[PDB]
Amino acid sequence: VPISPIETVPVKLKPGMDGPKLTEEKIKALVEICTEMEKEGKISKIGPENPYNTPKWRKLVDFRELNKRTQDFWEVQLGIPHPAGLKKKKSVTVLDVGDAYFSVPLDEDFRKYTAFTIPGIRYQYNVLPQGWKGSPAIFQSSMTKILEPFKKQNPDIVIYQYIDDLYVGSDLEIGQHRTKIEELRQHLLRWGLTTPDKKHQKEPPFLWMGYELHPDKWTVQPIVLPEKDSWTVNDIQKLVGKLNWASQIYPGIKVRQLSKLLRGTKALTEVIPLTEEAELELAENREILKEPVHGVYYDPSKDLIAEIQKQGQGQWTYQIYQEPFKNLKTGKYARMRGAHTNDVKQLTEAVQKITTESIVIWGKTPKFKLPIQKETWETWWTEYWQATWIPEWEFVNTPPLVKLWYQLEKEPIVGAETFYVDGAANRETKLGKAGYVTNKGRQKVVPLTNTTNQKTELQAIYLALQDSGLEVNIVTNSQYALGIIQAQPDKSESELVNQIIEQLIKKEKVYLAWVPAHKGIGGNEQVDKLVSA
Amino acid sequence: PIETVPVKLKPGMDGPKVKQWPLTEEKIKALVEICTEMEKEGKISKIGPENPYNTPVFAIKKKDSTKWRKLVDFRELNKRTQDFWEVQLGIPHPAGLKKKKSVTVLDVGDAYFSVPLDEDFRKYTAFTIPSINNKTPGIRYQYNVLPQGWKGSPAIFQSSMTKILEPFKKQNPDIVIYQYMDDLYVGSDLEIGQHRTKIEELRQHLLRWGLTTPGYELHPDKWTVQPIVLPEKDSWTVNDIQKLVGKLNWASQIYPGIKVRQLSKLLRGTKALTEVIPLTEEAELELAENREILKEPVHGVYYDPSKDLIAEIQKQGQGQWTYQIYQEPFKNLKTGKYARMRGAHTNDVKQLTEAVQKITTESIVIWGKTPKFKLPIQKETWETWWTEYWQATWIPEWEFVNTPPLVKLWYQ
DNA sequence: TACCCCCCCTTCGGTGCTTTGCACCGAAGGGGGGG
Numbered sequence A: 001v002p003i004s005p006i007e008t009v010p011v012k013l014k015p016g017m018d019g020p021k022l023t024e025e026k027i028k029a030l031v032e033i034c035t036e037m038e039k040e041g042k043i044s045k046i047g048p049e050n051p052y053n054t055p056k057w058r059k060l061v062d063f064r065e066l067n068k069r070t071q072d073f074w075e076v077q078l079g080i081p082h083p084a085g086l087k088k089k090k091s092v093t094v095l096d097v098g099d100a101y102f103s104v105p106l107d108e109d110f111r112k113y114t115a116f117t118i119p120g121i122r123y124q125y126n127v128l129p130q131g132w133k134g135s136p137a138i139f140q141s142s143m144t145k146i147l148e149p150f151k152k153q154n155p156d157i158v159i160y161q162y163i164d165d166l167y168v169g170s171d172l173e174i175g176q177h178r179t180k181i182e183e184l185r186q187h188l189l190r191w192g193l194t195t196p197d198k199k200h201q202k203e204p205p206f207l208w209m210g211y212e213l214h215p216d217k218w219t220v221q222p223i224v225l226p227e228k229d230s231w232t233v234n235d236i237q238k239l240v241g242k243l244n245w246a247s248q249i250y251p252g253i254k255v256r257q258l259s260k261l262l263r264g265t266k267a268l269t270e271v272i273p274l275t276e277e278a279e280l281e282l283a284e285n286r287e288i289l290k291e292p293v294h295g296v297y298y299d300p301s302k303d304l305i306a307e308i309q310k311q312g313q314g315q316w317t318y319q320i321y322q323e324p325f326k327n328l329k330t331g332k333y334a335r336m337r338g339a340h341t342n343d344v345k346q347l348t349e350a351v352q353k354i355t356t357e358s359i360v361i362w363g364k365t366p367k368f369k370l371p372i373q374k375e376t377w378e379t380w381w382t383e384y385w386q387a388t389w390i391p392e393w394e395f396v397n398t399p400p401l402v403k404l405w406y407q408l409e410k411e412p413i414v415g416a417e418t419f420y421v422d423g424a425a426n427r428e429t430k431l432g433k434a435g436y437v438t439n440k441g442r443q444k445v446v447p448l449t450n451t452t453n454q455k456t457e458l459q460a461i462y463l464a465l466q467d468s469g470l471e472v473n474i475v476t477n478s479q480y481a482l483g484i485i486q487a488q489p490d491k492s493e494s495e496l497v498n499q500i501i502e503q504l505i506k507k508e509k510v511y512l513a514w515v516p517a518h519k520g521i522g523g524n525e526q527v528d529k530l531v532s533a
Numbered sequence B: 001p002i003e004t005v006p007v008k009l010k011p012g013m014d015g016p017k018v019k020q021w022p023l024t025e026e027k028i029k030a031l032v033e034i035c036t037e038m039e040k041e042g043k044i045s046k047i048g049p050e051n052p053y054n055t056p057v058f059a060i061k062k063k064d065s066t067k068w069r070k071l072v073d074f075r076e077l078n079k080r081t082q083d084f085w086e087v088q089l090g091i092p093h094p095a096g097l098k099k100k101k102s103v104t105v106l107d108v109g110d111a112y113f114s115v116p117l118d119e120d121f122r123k124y125t126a127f128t129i130p131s132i133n134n135k136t137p138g139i140r141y142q143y144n145v146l147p148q149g150w151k152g153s154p155a156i157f158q159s160s161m162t163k164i165l166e167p168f169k170k171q172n173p174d175i176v177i178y179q180y181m182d183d184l185y186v187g188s189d190l191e192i193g194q195h196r197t198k199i200e201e202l203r204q205h206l207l208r209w210g211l212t213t214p215g216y217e218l219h220p221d222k223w224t225v226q227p228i229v230l231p232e233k234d235s236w237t238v239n240d241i242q243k244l245v246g247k248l249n250w251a252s253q254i255y256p257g258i259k260v261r262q263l264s265k266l267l268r269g270t271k272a273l274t275e276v277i278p279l280t281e282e283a284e285l286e287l288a289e290n291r292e293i294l295k296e297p298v299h300g301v302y303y304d305p306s307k308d309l310i311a312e313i314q315k316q317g318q319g320q321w322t323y324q325i326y327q328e329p330f331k332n333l334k335t336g337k338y339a340r341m342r343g344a345h346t347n348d349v350k351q352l353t354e355a356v357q358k359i360t361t362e363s364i365v366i367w368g369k370t371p372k373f374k375l376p377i378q379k380e381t382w383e384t385w386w387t388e389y390w391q392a393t394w395i396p397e398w399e400f401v402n403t404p405p406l407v408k409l410w411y412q
Numbered sequence C: 001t002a003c004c005c006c007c008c009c010t011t012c013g014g015t016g017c018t019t020t021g022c023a024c025c026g027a028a029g030g031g032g033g034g035g
């Protein structure tokens, strides 16, 4: 007869299907250990019930076939608690809860599905097995049900179960911590569990999931720095992965140029020759990685702030803290979102990422401190077609500040030269004619080579900008160029758009107007006839 | 006890297992307190680790209040149970509610709190409350009473609703009563005082049967499709004619009768944009004819209940938005504008959220089918901030247009 | 050699308009910390 102070969680099976049909140091003592399990109430003998078959430590039985037979359970935990979101603890003890895995009773009706009759004798589990898919979820829900009264009476105690242990953290001293450990031992033993631990008890810092957890600080495991003279693609991939992992506590890590080297080669053996910029960034990263830096834990009695800095070539860094120079977390954003974009959109995406990660980790929103003037943000967002919102924030003077390099005009400029542009091309022969025509009479058309209608039009505006004054009006016929230039890009994936942007930088006033072509309005017909042949 | 109507999904389709977005700490404390209060009343019961189903849950507010409300995203359970609450147990929709004078919206949510749910169907309506930093496993629950936000609850409860509201319908044949989720629309042709008196009478009639209730009216008369009008100018330069030709070329799809033959003869040469060009008599006649076309209702645009509604939204600056409800594009079933409520530049996600709540309510009033929104916003930004300013018991379906629209042809 | 959980970077296929290119997105490889 078994005992069960806790209720048993009912377990079903997938409908329409039934259950399917060693160690080294313990291969003859399995009989003795099975008799011990039977004696201590864990196992009860059975008879001719169902035809089944199953395959210092103890024998473990595989439930690989039965795992796909038991119903689906709930993934109790999915994420990992980042150390920054934790709390400072003056005492963190660990208790051994390894033997409690077999102390959770199984369902009354499900015991008949877990039979290990291979010696033939009769033997079936009456408690939670090991390796069963449903066993961990049931065990860790029973643990929560057991520990609910203890946490309800002691709110400051924090309990975490990583594998075969229970880490209990409190803000009291060790002398008062022993009393609480004894109280928890009695409370958990009223259900029949003892937790004696000697090995890792009071041994900080814990090396958990790659972090050293000191009582009042946290850090990452020391990053190994490869120093081979020649690097294969795999070495560069490992280096960028290690740098990405290390950037969470080390500010200033840049990986853009290093990661750029992986393009063009797909095999895993070639040794790509290095470049000066990549070596410079590697040396810069190694400069920070020499001295280890650690963060502090979150304080619920103070607000948190998040700074943003720019590193050039489309990458930003951020530090989230609660007290100046006492950081909670650091990070970097360098993702390219779209072929053509400016730095204000990158700032918006960055602050989006910090807001989302602070919601995930802290459940709040931090006050931002951005290197941008309020007037620039207003002038950009009130005119931009998209929708966006930045939470409560402030401006801090820190170069290089973000700003719009050039702005376009809404009304035509008086007394300004007016250029008409167009571009013709053939999809087959890759031929191109992209020239401009002016009202004053200046007509300039140049042959093209290896261009497409969109590229021909973009470089038609490029030609219009090449020979003009400070005040210019330009008339086009393609919505592609209008969209690109109205988006006000500061970077692109092509050199032509970069040259166009550089031309826009110099001009004092620029006007762009689009009118439909192939309709006989304005000089579009004239320029189309000129560029047709 | 009362009979529980058997509820079953369509065979070959599993239940809801989607995850939940992270929640703010206050929106978690309020959610936990509300769930505990409902647990003490037997509305929800804790579920063990044997239930693999989950639905998202959020915490919202209401205007002129300080207490939170719990909202459950049932957009997948509704799509799975579509047959139960559309074909077998649908709700009729009057065809003359948009022709009424004043429509008042009331809340009937607690009516679903007094009816038990099917025993076999109790496991699909399970939700989870997460925790900060994923530290301690979230608290799970399932619904015992009929669920709020599930579109099948009106289908089940209409049998009792008919018996509740039959005397009120008999005494007042001059008003129309429609039900959509916890929303009750009463449409009347009376005046403000008469409407408020009838609202109070309906409220006390509901209180007679025990319905827990602790500028609500709409004005469908002012809901008219915005007509497109060209802007008259004292001086007409080349650029103005160019813009007019572009706008007319765009609008020729909407109105096939628009012609730009004479308006093109004034730009044969290569003239500077600033220089002024006078208007000929033929061009003036063609422009007048185009305006005459513009001042007529659309032709060939017929509503179709079989298809699905799609709602375009465009930001026009200065806090102005323009919306277009249609089932087939360039064929507008409805077109309208919207402006803010307060401030110089207070918020933009709030404006888009309450605009969505306005047009979706208008579409429910007019046709009853929820339009599929196409929001000009980033997915991450919307999903982060779609809830802080959202005040409604139900959620529509939207997609995102990461595509730059260049049409400024709705706002003057 | 499985099979998962979160992150970053590059790549590619599909998709939609800006229309046979080009932009945008989400799913796949590789990397990082682990079960």
Ligand SMILES: Cc1cc(/C=C/C#N)cc(C)c1Nc1ccnc(Nc2ccc(C#N)cc2)n1
Residues within 6 Å of the ligand: A081, A086, A087, A088, A089, A092, A158, A159, A160, A162, A167, A168, A169, A204, A205, A206, A207, A208, A213, A214, A215, A216, B135
């Ligand atoms: C996630 C977590 C992981 C471990 C990891 C166990 C292992 N290996 C140990 C504990 C006790 C916890 N739980 C919590 C809960 C709230 N605050 C904290 N902060 C906190 C973290 C580490 C130390 C230390 N030393 C002190 C306080 N920990």
